[PDB]
Design an enzyme around this catalytic site. Sequence first.
Site, short mmCIF file in Angstrom:
data_model
loop_
_atom_site.label_atom_id
_atom_site.label_comp_id
_atom_site.label_asym_id
_atom_site.label_seq_id
_atom_site.Cartn_x
_atom_site.Cartn_y
_atom_site.Cartn_z
N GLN A 15 0.82 -1.21 0.00
CA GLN A 15 0.00 0.00 0.00
C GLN A 15 0.86 1.26 0.00
O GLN A 15 0.49 2.27 -0.64
CB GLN A 15 -0.97 -0.02 1.19
CG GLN A 15 -1.79 -1.31 1.18
CD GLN A 15 -3.18 -1.26 1.85
OE1 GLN A 15 -4.17 -1.61 1.19
NE2 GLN A 15 -3.26 -0.92 3.16
N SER A 140 6.13 -3.56 6.93
CA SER A 140 5.82 -3.31 8.33
C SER A 140 6.68 -4.15 9.24
O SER A 140 7.16 -5.22 8.86
CB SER A 140 4.34 -3.59 8.63
OG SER A 140 3.99 -4.90 8.26
N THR A 145 3.51 -11.35 7.25
CA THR A 145 4.32 -11.33 6.03
C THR A 145 5.39 -10.24 6.09
O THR A 145 6.57 -10.48 5.78
CB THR A 145 3.44 -11.09 4.81
OG1 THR A 145 2.38 -12.05 4.75
CG2 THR A 145 4.25 -11.13 3.54
N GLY A 146 5.00 -9.03 6.48
CA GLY A 146 5.94 -7.93 6.52
C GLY A 146 7.13 -8.20 7.40
O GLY A 146 8.26 -7.80 7.07
N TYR A 224 -5.38 4.36 6.49
CA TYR A 224 -4.17 4.03 5.75
C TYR A 224 -3.93 5.00 4.59
O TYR A 224 -2.78 5.39 4.35
CB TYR A 224 -4.22 2.59 5.25
CG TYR A 224 -4.12 1.60 6.36
CD1 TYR A 224 -3.10 1.69 7.33
CD2 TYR A 224 -5.06 0.58 6.50
CE1 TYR A 224 -3.01 0.75 8.39
CE2 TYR A 224 -4.99 -0.36 7.56
CZ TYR A 224 -3.96 -0.27 8.49
OH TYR A 224 -3.91 -1.19 9.51
N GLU A 254 26.13 6.07 -0.41
CA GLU A 254 26.33 7.38 0.20
C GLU A 254 25.40 7.60 1.38
O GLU A 254 25.74 8.37 2.29
CB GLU A 254 26.16 8.47 -0.86
CG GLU A 254 26.53 9.87 -0.40
CD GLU A 254 26.86 10.80 -1.57
OE1 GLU A 254 26.82 10.30 -2.73
OE2 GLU A 254 27.17 12.01 -1.32
N1 LIG Z 1 1.29 3.24 7.57
C1 LIG Z 1 0.67 2.15 7.15
N2 LIG Z 1 0.67 1.07 7.98
C2 LIG Z 1 0.05 -0.06 7.61
C3 LIG Z 1 -0.59 -0.17 6.40
N3 LIG Z 1 -1.11 -1.41 6.36
C4 LIG Z 1 -0.80 -2.08 7.50
N4 LIG Z 1 -0.09 -1.23 8.29
C5 LIG Z 1 0.51 -1.50 9.60
O1 LIG Z 1 1.18 -2.72 9.44
C6 LIG Z 1 1.04 -3.50 10.62
C7 LIG Z 1 0.34 -4.78 10.23
O2 LIG Z 1 1.16 -5.38 9.28
P1 LIG Z 1 0.60 -5.68 7.81
O3 LIG Z 1 1.47 -5.06 6.75
O4 LIG Z 1 -0.85 -5.28 7.69
O5 LIG Z 1 0.77 -7.27 7.80
P2 LIG Z 1 1.27 -8.14 6.57
O6 LIG Z 1 2.74 -7.93 6.36
O7 LIG Z 1 0.36 -7.91 5.40
O8 LIG Z 1 1.12 -9.63 7.08
P3 LIG Z 1 -0.32 -10.28 7.18
O9 LIG Z 1 -0.34 -10.64 8.66
O10 LIG Z 1 -0.21 -11.42 6.19
O11 LIG Z 1 -1.48 -9.40 6.67
C8 LIG Z 1 0.23 -2.72 11.63
O12 LIG Z 1 1.18 -2.18 12.51
C9 LIG Z 1 -0.46 -1.68 10.76
O13 LIG Z 1 -0.64 -0.47 11.44
C10 LIG Z 1 -0.60 0.92 5.53
O14 LIG Z 1 -1.16 0.87 4.42
N5 LIG Z 1 0.04 2.07 5.94
MG LIG Z 2 -1.70 -9.34 4.73
#
Ligand SMILES: Nc1nc2c(ncn2[C@@H]2O[C@H](COP(=O)(O)OP(=O)(O)OP(=O)(O)O)[C@@H](O)[C@H]2O)c(=O)[nH]1
Ligand SMILES: [Mg+2]
Lengths: 437, 54, 334, 427
Positions: A15, A140, A145-146, A224, A254
């Site tokens: 996103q 994240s 996943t993140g 978001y 750099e």
């Molecule tokens: N700033 C911002 N934070 C996000 C967004 N989407 C999720 N988050 C943050 O990301 C964290 C949740 O991680 P996600 O990225 O939604 O999880 P994921 O990596 O998709 O892993 P899943 O558990 O598979 O959905 C929380 O702390 C949310 O506040 C976004 O579009 N913008």
């Molecule tokens: Mg997800």
Amino acid sequence: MRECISIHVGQAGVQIGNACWELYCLEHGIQPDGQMPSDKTIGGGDDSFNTFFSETGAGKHVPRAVFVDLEPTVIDEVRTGTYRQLFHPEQLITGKEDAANNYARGHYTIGKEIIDLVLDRIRKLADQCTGLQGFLVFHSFGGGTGSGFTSLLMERLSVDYGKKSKLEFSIYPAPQVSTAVVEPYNSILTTHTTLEHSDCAFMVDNEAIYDICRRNLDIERPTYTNLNRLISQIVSSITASLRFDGALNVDLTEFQTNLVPYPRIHFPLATYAPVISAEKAYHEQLSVAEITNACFEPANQMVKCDPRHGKYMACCLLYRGDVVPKDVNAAIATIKTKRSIQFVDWCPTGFKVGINYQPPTVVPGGDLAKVQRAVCMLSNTTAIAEAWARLDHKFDLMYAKRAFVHWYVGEGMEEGEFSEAREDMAALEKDYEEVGV
Amino acid sequence: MEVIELNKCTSGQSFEVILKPPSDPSLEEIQKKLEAAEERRKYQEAELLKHLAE
Amino acid sequence: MYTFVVRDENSSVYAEVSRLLLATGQWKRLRKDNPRFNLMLGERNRLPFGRLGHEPGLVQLVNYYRGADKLCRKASLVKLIKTSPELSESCTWFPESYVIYPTDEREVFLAAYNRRREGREGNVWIALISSEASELLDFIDEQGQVHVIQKYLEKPLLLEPGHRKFDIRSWVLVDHLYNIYLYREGVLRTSSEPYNSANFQDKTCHLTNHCIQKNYGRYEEGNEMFFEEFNQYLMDALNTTLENSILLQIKHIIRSCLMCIEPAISTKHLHYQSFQLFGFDFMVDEELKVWLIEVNGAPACAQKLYAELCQGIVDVAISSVFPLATSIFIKLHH
Amino acid sequence: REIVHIQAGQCGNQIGAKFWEVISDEHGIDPTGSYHGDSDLQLERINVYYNEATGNKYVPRAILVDLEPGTMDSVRSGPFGQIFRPDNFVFGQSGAGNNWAKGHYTEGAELVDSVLDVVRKESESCDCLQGFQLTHSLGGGTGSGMGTLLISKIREEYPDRIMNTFSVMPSPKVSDTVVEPYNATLSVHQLVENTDETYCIDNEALYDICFRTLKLTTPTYGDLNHLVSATMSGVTTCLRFPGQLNADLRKLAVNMVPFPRLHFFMPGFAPLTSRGSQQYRALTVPELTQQMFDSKNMMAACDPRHGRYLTVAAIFRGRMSMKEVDEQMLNVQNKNSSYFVEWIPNNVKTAVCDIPPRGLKMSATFIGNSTAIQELFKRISEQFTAMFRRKAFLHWYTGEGMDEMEFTEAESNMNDLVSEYQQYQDA
Ligand SMILES: Nc1nc2c(ncn2[C@@H]2O[C@H](COP(=O)(O)OP(=O)(O)OP(=O)(O)O)[C@@H](O)[C@H]2O)c(=O)[nH]1
Ligand SMILES: [Mg+2]
Ligand SMILES: Nc1ncnc2c1ncn2[C@@H]1O[C@H](COP(=O)(O)OP(=O)(O)CP(=O)(O)O)[C@@H](O)[C@H]1O
Ligand SMILES: Nc1nc2c(ncn2[C@@H]2O[C@H](COP(=O)(O)OP(=O)(O)O)[C@@H](O)[C@H]2O)c(=O)[nH]1
Ligand SMILES: Cc1nc(N(C)c2ccc3c(ccn3C)c2)c2sccc2n1
Ligand SMILES: [Ca+2]
Ligand SMILES: [Mg+2]
């Protein structure tokens, strides 16, 4: 000219990548079909914007970018979104069962089964690069996943590209917009496994983006979308020096040589002003001195913390708009006499400065007003360690009872990996303490 | 005070300003860990299915 | 219904503030580690400022100023006074001091010790009180930690009857807005054994701490002379008032010290807010000239003034952020 | 991410049938199975619970199970009876006679293979199956005993999918037979081992709410199931509807269950309403929040002030200020923080959905994993022991091959559960 491949992992990463690559197109004048009337060299060119776009004989400009999620829901909106024509399919990688907020499930269980396919799809962009510099990885801390897949990917990128650089744009967990109670576990886990594989990480605390969106943009309940347009300007500020003509931060190496003396301490604090509401009717434009002064107010920092009670190791001021060096130095000399700026002994008290005369591009119809000058400050303050304190304390509370740990161990992880990770963060926090007090 | 390394161009400019002077795992080890947690996942599922067979 | 937590049990002062807050039926006390608190009477060491101000829908306020240690530790205070332009070396109310590290400005300290011996003027110094450099530096290395060497004020104002020495403690309260309030009740912690100018070994008539004196209680209850009686005395003995001869300089030093660090510790645009009570320790010489001895950051009160001070702390430092459903303070304006 | 829904026994089929009635209306499906609605929010995730046939028909992914045909005849001739896939009705003829034994070991074992066949047919149509939700009571024989038998077999074939149950607990206030505490103690024993998430729908609580709060002198099972379908619609919204969270059965388990055995949830609902009696005044957001947390709105009969919430999941449906929702939710946690454990930071999560349930302009559904839930299991354990110490009514079970030893184990496992819950109430 040397290219940069951008990897967005998980929901927040994908996103935010949509936010940035949209901005990036408005900045460089690239319509939502890949067409840039300006690139007279149809099909090629070692220009400054070709570090993020490749061209095609068709005339299309296409982001050196790959999107990856263990679930099709979010990336499917890039597939059918206004910027679908920008990306080719090979670049959009979707799995079937996401990590259910579970690092061990994104890193081990579901990770293991897609890592190879992702690496192949990245080797397809590395292959069209005459001189790859490395990678920008958006994700994240808190997601399954993140946090989990990203740290696997990061380990593999160091073995397949050991000479290349890796930067992080990482979203730090905040409860106002949280998705899971285990985000403290996933953070300390992914930070530990990634720490040695990352050269520079820009941490953006969702708490801070949310309050900035509330105080200065007058959004009552930021979504978001609100958050991601504010975050994309910050990202754009940092990457503009790689997509435009300049002499400051022109390659990825750099960023380390200007912001990161000690390798482990590689989390520069980002500060940004002015954030002005689009529908604020009468607005008096802020001077160089005014915006530069605001770089030292914690209320404008991507991570809430107090740099007066730490030390700086480096510091960059990235201007965009009507700024000349004369007014920068003026503002600095007044600020140094009004504010607490302590550098560590073994570093010169100073500011590398970059000015890009093009004022910040703004998303048409968004929440941010156009302005005549904006600055993003990048300082490596020991003060950011407060953010690790906060997170480590929350982690400590839950782990003291092994709460939720069974969800990880059930996935193949070992209870000892938790304490290995936490001891690392305990090290890091101490490194900050030696450097800073 | 001292302004150094000033580079100007058509798009912007860059300089420094000094106020005071100073005073990896291998691919083998990664496939090992990934498969070692696959073994624990299998072992636990097989204890489950064994119990369910009792 | 506001919430708070106690994290320093050994605070006589804030022991009494919690009892007052509970007694309004609008302040509930939570457990040490509950983070969902409106107010924190925190610990004295390693207080976790990094964890304040991050509880959504909570306005968080603590009773210490992060960074105020620079004013409340003897080594820091010297360094602060000597490097800050706003206070300076020509600072006319702080005794000549130097920082000395065990085996730094040890060569600089001797350079003044010679002018003073090569001028045949007074040469007593303090850390133990002695008139020779060598027994002092031998004492610092024999202790272990960092010490401060300071000019001893050889001509103190001596109270009569008794020929007694004293020191003035002022209690100052700084709120979240950085209003500097001075408590109208000071205290003179006096010596009961007549001051002896020649023997500096007897540290019972040179050091005026309430503990050391416990002739105690001879002239005034508990070796504690309040302001009304100390003013009456100066009127009678010296034809001057507490206000004109002493207080004006005390208000000036307090203001100077706190004005100096305000940019480094203020919580004006911060995500948590701070207030703090200070103990300022002044020394009056025989020409009615006030000297700053030290600032204490965790001060205790005198048993008569607890009820009135602690109630003022609630009024101006706490209720002002968390209101409920003439003034004992002098605001030192700036 | 498809969910496969199972409903076993008399109770299981009646509340199940009302769930599908309710959430169909919410998604715009008619008894025929055609869409006749106005918001696109309705169809965006309708794949989680419905299949699609040609002619843009939506058929629920539900399996209907019983040992006597009587009640599943009722369902077929009920309002939405024709929307269920007729191949998914799986029934015997003997009945189970309110005998857990018969459901788990004799009568039930006969039928359970037919049922798993239909379970598999639906699972193979699934693009990615997330797991199962079963509705059933614990005091009868079919839903109780063959339901928990279905769970043990479904776990063996799908050990990596989520098993989620809505389990009606029995009360002397609404009682069919005196062996109910035997059936339920045998069943809690199964649920502790083989589900991830159980909503404890206690009939005691449902009767008290009809009598005391809703002023209904003699409540029917219909009056009980209105509360139940309302609660079911609520707790599933963040699976059915697009929103800021977008949860699934596994994400709910991970965030709700700090330790795998303590997975028994107290649902709550506000505003409580009785059948037919329309309410003209919508509630303010401070009103929903005060109500949904009150004992008089819990569907498990436990005093939440006799214990601490480990985790909380809240859902507000309707057009309302999400800013105000956030402040109210924060207020409750800040005003009564002694009732939330401090070793799980940020243990309350709220979600919103604009679409409200039928007949309300705004509602609040509550999912609490409290340690007060032991009051439920303890009540049952007393009722079990008062009969067991005299081995009373046991012949009905030993007659089907069971041995007293199986009862003593179930009793012990449920007492363990109560201690386990008590452990974390004093942490
Ligand atoms: N700033 C911002 N934070 C996000 C967004 N989407 C999720 N988050 C943050 O990301 C964290 C949740 O991680 P996600 O990225 O939604 O999880 P994921 O990596 O998709 O892993 P899943 O558990 O598979 O959905 C929380 O702390 C949310 O506040 C976004 O579009 N913008
Ligand atoms: Mg997800
Ligand atoms: N430079 C000086 N000249 C004269 N007398 C001095 C002096 N420094 C200290 N004194 C005397 O010796 C005593 C000890 O001073 P000091 O303030 O260091 O004690 P202390 O550390 O207990 C007070 P605090 O509560 O601030 O820590 C003072 O109370 C005062 O009477
Ligand atoms: N709340 C509720 N409870 C029910 C319903 N039907 C039966 N019960 C309860 O279910 C238990 C009997 O189980 P039942 O479902 O008839 O037995 P089964 O058909 O063999 O599984 C008793 O505690 C009844 O109170 C119902 O429709 N709603
Ligand atoms: C199906 C479902 N899942 C949810 N998740 C997954 C959840 C639960 C509880 C949670 C979180 C985050 C912290 N805590 C304590 C997320 C939620 S949250 C509100 C309704 C809801 N509904
Ligand atoms: Ca070109
Ligand atoms: Mg029946």
